[PDB]
Structure formats: C-alpha cells, structure tokens
Amino acid sequence: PQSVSRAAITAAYRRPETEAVSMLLEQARLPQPVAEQAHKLAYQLADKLRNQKNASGRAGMVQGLLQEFSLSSQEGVALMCLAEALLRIPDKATRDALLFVNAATWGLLFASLSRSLNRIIEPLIRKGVDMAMRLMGEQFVTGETIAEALANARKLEEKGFRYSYDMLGEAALTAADAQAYMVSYQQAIHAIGKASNGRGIYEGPGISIKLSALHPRYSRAQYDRVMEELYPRLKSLTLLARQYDIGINIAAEESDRLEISLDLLEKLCFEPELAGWNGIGFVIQAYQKRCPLVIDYLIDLATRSRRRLMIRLVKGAYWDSEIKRAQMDGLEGYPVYTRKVYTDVSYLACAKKLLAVPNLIYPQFATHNAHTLAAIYQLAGQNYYPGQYEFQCLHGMGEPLYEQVTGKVADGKLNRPCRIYAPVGTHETLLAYLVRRLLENGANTSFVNRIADTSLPLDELVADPVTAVEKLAQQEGQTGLPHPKIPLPRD
Ligand SMILES: Cc1cc2nc3c(=O)[nH]c(=O)nc-3n(C[C@H](O)[C@H](O)[C@H](O)COP(=O)(O)OP(=O)(O)OC[C@H]3O[C@@H](n4cnc5c(N)ncnc54)[C@H](O)[C@@H]3O)c2cc1C
Ligand SMILES: O=C(O)[C@@H]1CCCO1
C-alpha cells in the first residue's frame, strides 16, 4: 500500500479536466490588488520586449504614410526604396531639383521551390534534416564541451545570473550509450564543481541530468532493474555534486515515468552521505493533473528526510507527445491539460503551494512568460531575500525578458536572480532537445510566439489565466471543459 500522499498522486493521474481545473481555480486566483500589480508589471515587461529597437513605434509611422497617401504594402516599400535612393544624393540642391513560409529567412543564409523540391530529391533529405537541425539549434546551445560553456559563464554571472548545465543526450537505447552518458555527466560535475569553487548551491552553477540517459530503454524499464542499475548511478552523481557543493537537478520527462522518478528521489533523499545537504533538485511539470499532488508529496518528503528541496516548477516540454500517446493508449483521459490556459492556472496554483513552505522548498520558477513571471513576483510577497526563490530560463529564449529582471534596481531591474539552463554538446546530441524547442517556439499558444505577433494587443498577451478560464466557463456552460479539438481518447 502507498503512503497517503503517494496514493493521492496516483488517484489524480487522469482526473477529468472539469474537475481538475475547477479545483485549481481559487488557489490560482490573485487577490484584486495583487492581480493589478501583476498586470502592470507584466504589461511593462512585455512592452519593453516588443519595443526593443522601437519595433512597434516604427510600425506605427509606417501605417500613417501607408494611408495618408492611400497605399498598400508594396506601394509604401517601393516609395521607401526611391526615398532611400534620393537620400543618397550628396547635395540637397541636386536632390530637390530632381511549407515555404520562412523561405525568406532561410535565404539570408544564402511556388517554384515546390518544383525544385519535387525535382532535387532520401540521403539528401536525411542530410537536409541534419543541417537544418544544426542551423536552428545553434541559438539554443551554449557550447560543444563543458569547458567551453564554463569559460563563457563570467559575463552573465557577474551581472547576477546563475547557470544549470545540461550535457545533451537522452533516451539511451543500449547499455553502452547509458554508460557513455554516465561518463559525460560525471565529467561535467567535476568541471562545474571546480568552476563553482565553493560558491555553493544557490550562487554557484549546477547540473541538470535526465534519468532516461542513465538507463537503457528507460521508457519501458521495470522498477526492479531501475533500482538495481539506475539508482546506484543517480546516487554516485549526487554524491559527487555534494562533494563540490553544486545543485543537481533531476529532469522531468514523459508522464509515465513520473512514478519511478519519485521512487528514485525517495530513496536518494535518505542516503546518509547526503544528510544535511540541500542540493538535490527535482523538476515538476504543471501541465500534469498530478502536479499539485506531487507537491504535497514533496513537502512531506522534505520534512521526513530533513532537507530543503530545490524544486523547479515548469509547465512542461512534452505536451504534443503526451496527447498523441494518450490517444494511442485509448484510456479514460489525458494526464495533461488540453487547453493551454489550464496549464497556466495550474502553474499559478502550484507556485502558491511552493512559496508557502520556504523552510522545505526552494522554488525555481522556470518561465519565459511575462505574466507568469510578474504573477510569481507578486505572489512571493514583500521582503524578498535571495534564498527565497529564483527564476529560470532556457539559453536562447529567456535572456531579453530576464535582462529586465536580474540586476540592480538602480539600473532599472527587479533585482531577482535567474538561472540560465545551458545545453552543452555537439550535433549528435542536439536532435530531441531542438525538436522540443521548435514545438515550444512555433506553437500559436506559446507566449514567445504570441509576443512576436504585433497584431495581438499587450493586454491580451498578458491576460490573467484565471479570468480567462471564468470567461470560457460563462460562454461554454461549465468550468474546465477540454479543448474542443481534443476529445477524450475513447471518442
Ligand atoms: C530553465 C527551464 C527548465 C525546464 N526544465 C523542464 C523539464 O525538466 N521537463 C519539462 O517537461 N519541461 C521543462 N521546462 C519547460 C519547457 O521546456 C518549456 O520551456 C515551458 O513549458 C514553457 O513555459 P512558459 O511559461 O515559458 O511558456 P508559455 O507560452 O506560457 O507556456 C507554454 C506551455 O504550455 C503548455 N501547453 C501548450 N499547449 C497546451 C495545451 N493545448 N494544453 C495544456 N497545456 C499546453 C506546454 O507546457 C507549453 O510548453 C523547462 C523550462 C525552463 C525555462
Ligand atoms: O529537455 C527539455 O526540452 C526540457 C527543457 C530543459 C530540460 O527539459
């Protein structure tokens, strides 16, 4: 039989969405004054983001000339090209007297393409995929080796940023692959630990590890072999992190691995060599219905094992695959929400739960969403101290938002720390991570995609998720209905 908290997790696995969302709503609701402050801050963060290099203000003036003379796009553009040519006349007197969407962006590296594609064509296609992967993935990778990544840390660390490094690579298929990942992780801990040089788990850099890298065919692995084989590896790495006093974070992956990951964490927290050390980190995904129940479990685990757990709250990286897997298994429901706004509500409710127990949990709020960030900033309350919480972001996505956050108040920043997640590796380790970033950046529901859509007003972009849910409820007839285009698997 399971403990009370473990049993509650299991029972919530595929809770009906009407139920799960209805339950979260009042825990996610910000009191009116807090809601108002969160809105104003979110608005201001998002405004600066958009209007970097005057993107919006330039977009204005354009529309005016593109009307005050009655013209279309190509009309205005043509008029600019001439104006530019006229502006290149040195002397004023002389002047006065006179599938293939991002094909454009792809061209700067260099309907008729459709024929070229049909023509030019599998070893080609496989080669095309590999190079496109590298080209797009570059912006998300901090270095090829941990040494290169680390030798790059000073610039942002001196501004108050922190790092968590990820030696890319996951889902080991063979015993040999898992062993190689083990060696890579170990190597990385030695390097990060030496660089950290005693700065500790808060100020100093840490590492993020995927359990799927450390065990062959983890996706279908049984408890008995995971404990016999994976656990000693997890323990070994964590002991080494502890010797260097750096944080070590256990990544959250597919939802059917949540249970085994909790079993591993439970065992890890009771190792004698880790007594009194608070550097163990664990990620939880707010897009899961189980998330708040996992928090209750974690709170009890911190108490029983006598430590402060580092808990990274994220929304989640595997949503597309989760929906697909659930539709294939034909079960009673989904282990994740089907509307993005419900994940947002879940994240806010879970953030409140984490912030309530600062003796037991150090919350690490991973997000690139300006509203989510502003809400957490307000929910954390008055009298911030550095060890209360931190924000986190992915390299290549979070820096512009967080340049308004980490740093001095005198320089116009919020003075809250952000830990940058820093992937390290060569092209052979990049694929899976890059695909997830493509899904994240390309989704019409994602904040980073919406903020780039200048037709979407700021107020809509940073709209309160709880209010959004209640708006849906008033229109649709009940709270927390599933996405209209995502029926239950058995339907
Ligand atoms: C530093 C860092 C570490 C992370 N570590 C992990 C990890 O170990 N494991 C992991 O799984 N994730 C992890 N993530 C999260 C993941 O990689 C995405 O970055 C994150 O979910 C984006 O959230 P947001 O607040 O930035 O963006 P938003 O645009 O606010 O939120 C986007 C998220 O909404 C969710 N979503 C999208 N569509 C729907 C829908 N129709 N219904 C319900 N939910 C939906 C997805 O989770 C999506 O990522 C991490 C993120 C960061 C910044
Ligand atoms: O691998 C991923 O896509 C997420 C983001 C960082 C770690 O887990």
Side-chain angles (χ1 to χ4, degrees), residues 1-31 33-35 37-39 41-47 49-51 54-55 57-60 62 64 76-107 111 114 117-118 122-125 128-153 156-202 204-227 229-305 307-330 332-407 409-484 486-491:
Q2 289 189 300
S3 70
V4 168
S5 61
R6 289 296 300 267
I9 290 174
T10 296
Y13 203 158
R14 303 168 191 94
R15 180 162 288 156
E17 260 185 299
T18 49
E19 201 171 309
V21 173
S22 286
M23 290 174 169
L24 303 167
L25 207 60
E26 297 306 324
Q27 319 179 33
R29 185 185 310 275
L30 279 71
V34 185
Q37 296 305 316
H39 172 81
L41 176 55
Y43 186 99
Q44 165 191 341
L45 295 168
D47 197 24
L49 224 36
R50 243 174 211 185
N51 306 348
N54 201 9
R58 283 160 77 80
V62 151
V77 172
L79 171 58
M80 289 297 106
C81 299
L82 165 74
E84 177 187 345
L86 293 164
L87 284 169
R88 290 179 191 283
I89 297 165
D91 298 300
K92 197 196 187 303
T94 304
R95 175 194 314 130
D96 292 346
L98 184 72
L99 182 65
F100 308 88
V101 183
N102 310 333
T105 318
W106 273 113
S114 190
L117 192 63
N118 290 328
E122 179 199 20
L124 170 77
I125 294 180
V129 166
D130 182 76
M131 211 184 63
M133 171 195 63
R134 297 185 185 201
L135 264 12
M136 291 185 295
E138 209 178 276
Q139 64 193 300
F140 302 117
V141 175
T142 66
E144 317 262 311
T145 60
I146 186 56
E148 174 183 353
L150 281 167
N152 228 85
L156 290 183
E157 280 188 339
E158 279 180 358
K159 291 152 97 301
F161 285 88
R162 300 136 178 215
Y163 284 90
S164 176
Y165 296 95
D166 168 14
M167 299 309 294
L168 290 165
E170 67 191 62
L173 294 188
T174 58
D177 285 340
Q179 177 52 52
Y181 288 138
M182 181 62 171
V183 169
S184 170
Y185 283 171
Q186 269 177 329
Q187 174 241 8
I189 289 169
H190 281 292
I192 299 165
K194 288 168 189 173
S196 176
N197 193 31
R199 278 180 282 168
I201 66 173
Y202 298 105
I207 191 173
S208 290
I209 58 168
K210 285 182 162 54
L211 301 172
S212 72
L214 298 173
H215 190 81
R217 310 285 294 266
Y218 181 66
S219 57
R220 297 183 59 82
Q222 302 262 316
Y223 173 94
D224 274 340
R225 270 192 75 258
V226 167
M227 288 311 163
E229 293 168 34
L230 209 187
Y231 180 76
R233 287 182 164 160
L234 175 68
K235 172 177 169 193
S236 164
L237 296 173
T238 303
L239 286 202
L240 193 64
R242 187 250 192 281
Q243 294 172 25
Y244 286 105
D245 201 30
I246 72 175
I248 176 172
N249 173 261
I250 302 173
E253 302 180 73
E254 314 76 30
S255 63
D256 74 339
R257 299 288 79 187
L258 172 67
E259 284 285 324
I260 190 66
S261 78
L262 296 170
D263 292 345
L264 289 160
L265 173 73
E266 173 79 30
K267 196 179 171 63
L268 188 65
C269 290
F270 286 91
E271 292 291 342
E273 293 150 298
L274 304 177
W277 189 67
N278 297 325
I280 301 172
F282 192 81
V283 178
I284 56 182
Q285 298 148 318
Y287 67 3
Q288 297 212 43
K289 292 155 183 190
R290 285 172 299 179
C291 195
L293 292 309
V294 173
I295 294 175
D296 293 336
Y297 164 76
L298 296 174
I299 289 173
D300 179 73
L301 173 60
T303 302
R304 291 184 291 109
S305 65
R307 72 198 46 253
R308 187 181 198 207
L309 289 169
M310 303 181 98
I311 299 302
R312 180 194 295 161
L313 183 57
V314 310
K315 293 178 193 174
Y318 305 81
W319 185 82
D320 292 278
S321 286
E322 295 288 347
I323 298 302
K324 173 155 200 52
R325 190 159 305 103
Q327 290 175 345
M328 279 173 147
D329 298 349
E332 88 264 24
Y334 298 94
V336 296
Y337 299 100
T338 60
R339 279 175 148 158
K340 190 264 182 184
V341 69
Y342 300 161
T343 292
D344 285 343
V345 164
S346 171
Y347 191 105
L348 298 175
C350 289
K352 261 192 207 166
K353 290 175 70 71
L354 298 176
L355 284 162
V357 287
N359 55 314
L360 299 175
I361 288 174
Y362 178 64
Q364 300 165 305
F365 294 108
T367 186
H368 303 131
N369 181 317
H371 178 273
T372 309
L373 188 167
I376 270 46
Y377 178 86
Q378 304 292 333
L379 283 174
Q382 321 173 50
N383 317 124
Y384 179 79
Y385 53 96
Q388 185 190 11
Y389 73 93
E390 68 184 17
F391 290 109
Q392 301 204 346
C393 74
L394 304 180
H395 174 68
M397 293 184 71
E399 287 96 349
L401 170 57
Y402 284 99
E403 283 289 1
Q404 305 178 62
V405 178
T406 301
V409 178
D411 299 345
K413 283 103 194 278
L414 300 181
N415 191 20
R416 301 291 182 263
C418 176
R419 185 177 307 271
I420 300 161
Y421 182 97
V424 177
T426 59
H427 56 85
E428 289 158 26
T429 65
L430 176 58
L431 180 56
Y433 186 89
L434 188 263
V435 176
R436 291 188 299 271
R437 303 289 78 68
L438 290 189
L439 294 171
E440 185 177 359
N441 284 271
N444 87 281
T445 54
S446 293
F447 182 89
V448 299
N449 189 277
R450 283 161 57 93
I451 197 163
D453 181 6
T454 58
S455 76
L456 181 67
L458 285 171
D459 284 342
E460 276 180 56
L461 177 71
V462 297
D464 178 66
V466 167
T467 298
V469 167
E470 300 188 298
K471 189 186 170 201
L472 280 171
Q474 196 276 336
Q475 180 175 23
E476 293 186 314
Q478 84 187 92
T479 296
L481 286 172
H483 197 295
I486 314 186
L488 286 175
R490 289 148 168 178
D491 302 337

